[PDB]
Design a protein around this ligand. Structure first.
Ligand SMILES: Cc1ccc(NC(=O)Nc2cccc(C(=O)O)c2)cc1
Ligand SMILES: Cc1ccc(NC(=O)Nc2cccc(C(=O)O)c2)cc1
Ligand SMILES: *Cc1c(COP(=O)(O)O)cnc(C)c1O
Ligand SMILES: *Cc1c(COP(=O)(O)O)cnc(C)c1O
Lengths: 287, 285
């Protein structure tokens, strides 16, 4: 039991995918899904968002009633909006205008102000916009998820240890590459404990300051169509209603697994389910 | 770890509502009056219905009622349908849901994604008639199947007692009545003087047992929507609309304890999250 929604975070389930795995029972090639939608606002960003705020509190950077400013494509904004309601802060998000309606509904419900940046240039445009706002009003506190080490540390101290506890036999960890915190933190932790572990990025077909290229074994770029087809496959075969990035991660993980199978090598491949499908229904991807 | 999503069910968190509670800390003014929220959206398909749905299907399988490719038929307003749709897909059954026409589009989308057939409709009568027409169809029948109540007697109740052994009250919505009959019978059988409190919207399922409830509150939609919004604003929990009604009743009970100067530790169910209700407008800025 917990005294705050903020504490009911992490320790997410790992679920073996018996049907989707290239070979569940030569040696096995298993996929294991870590369900990060089992978190306060339904995404993995609850981990870095809460740690970034708490670290800024510890460092003296946030006084009561302060205004937080953050560029986001939705999930981090939502997690910060939740935490800001519990902690008494205001939030201004800069978010690209071509994002799902569910994201803006959630943000408005939590009381965040949203500046909708131009679609052209996507995240780079949102980040440049947020930096421009930060410079016009220095009292606003930008935690800066793309450069804040508390993002990586949330995974070094949370995601990674939980994976190793649940799956000591892990051979590969597969996740999306956005802020890079998930892969940097989880991957640094796993490399310290697991001889020979492979860390694999999925990215959509600037460089965050958190990024350390030497943590990755490989980077796969995934198209939206393949991400949609795999997201659909995951819900049809395993019942997990995931967001689109999960489909891209699964595409990569299934590539890794097909390689292991063809080589006669045992693999236990952990993959992140970073959020659920709820915020993506309006896209038509699940029709 | 688990090797099926169906196992990653239950064992849901209980979260203290320090801001919404009438009095979180014992003080000069009198003893604490605490609200504790059980987050049943942390379940395979995002609602408490995963508990009875999985148990009903598994009980029907153990009893020898289902064969590969069997058709299951269920009257539902959406949550049980969704739960059954997911489990039927994994187990190789066909699902037909009889639903009222005025339900949120999100429900329809999730049912169709899992591959359920939807018949619109009264829904219970329509299902019963169809089941009679097609004797090979299996109608689990959430309004009368004891595996619904048992899922709460064996799951929700003991989990809640383990996390909150100081419990004074349990509050939940009254629909199929499984949650309150199961959890309530468990609690009343274990905890002297515990209060079992229903929230109902302003036929009687066969599962209903009139001796279990100690109090029953009718809550209007306006109050349910206001409380749902209050919960997200004050505690950050993005709940469904039934949770607002449950909160309304829980706060009533809490105000009573506060006025009487009595300690209370009131557990309440958050049966689903707000996701499926965004299309209603209930969560507008
Ligand atoms: C293949 C693929 C597809 C989608 C993603 N998603 C992201 O990287 N999301 C992301 C990145 C940076 C910030 C945020 C945010 O919620 O603010 C989200 C990652 C990888
Ligand atoms: C005050 C209040 C408001 C809403 C509820 N919700 C319900 O009872 N939901 C319900 C009832 C019966 C069947 C189903 C179903 O998912 O099929 C849902 C319960 C109480
Ligand atoms: C943030 C995010 C990612 C990428 O994770 P990072 O730790 O930012 O690299 C992938 N998928 C979803 C849904 C996300 O919100
Ligand atoms: C089913 C349900 C209820 C009522 O629970 P019962 O066990 O059917 O009485 C309340 N809220 C939600 C969201 C539900 O799906």
């Amino acid at each position: 039991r917990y005294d705050s929604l903020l504490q009911a975070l992490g320790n997410t389930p790992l679920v073996g995918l018996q049907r989707l795995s290239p070979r569940w029972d030569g040696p096995h090639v298993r996929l294991w899904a870590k369900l990060e939608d089992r978190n306060p606002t339904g995404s993995i960003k609850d981990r870095p968002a809460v740690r970034m705020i708490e670290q800024a509190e510890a460092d003296g950077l946030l006084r009561p009633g302060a205004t937080i400013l953050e560029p986001t494509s939705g999930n981090t904004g939502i997690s910060l909006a939740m935490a800001a309601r519990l902690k008494g802060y205001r939030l201004i998000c800069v978010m690209p205008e071509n994002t799902s309606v569910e994201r803006r509904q959630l943000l408005e419900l939590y009381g965040a102000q949203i500046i909708f940046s131009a679609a052209e240039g996507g995240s780079n445009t949102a980040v440049a916009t947020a930096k421009e706002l930060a410079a016009t009003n220095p009292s606003w506190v930008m935690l800066y998820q793309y450069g804040n080490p508390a993002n990586t540390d949330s995974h070094y101290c949370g995601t990674g240890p939980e994976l190793l506890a649940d799956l000591p036999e892990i051979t590969h960890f597969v996740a999306g590459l956005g802020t890079t915190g998930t892969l940097m933190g989880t991957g640094r932790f796993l490399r310290e404990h697991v001889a020979n572990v492979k860390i694999v990025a999925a990215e959509p077909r600037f460089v965050p300051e958190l990024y350390d290229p030497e943590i990755l074994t490989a980077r796969y770029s995934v198209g939206a169509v393949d991400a949609v087809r795999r997201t659909r496959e995951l819900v049809h075969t395993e019942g997990i209603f995931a967001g689109i990035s999960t489909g891209a991660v699964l595409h990569a993980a299934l590539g890794v697994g097909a390689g292991a199978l063809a080589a006669g090598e045992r693999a236990d491949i952990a993959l992140v389910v970073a959020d659920a499908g709820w915020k993506y229904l309006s896209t038509g991807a699940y029709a």
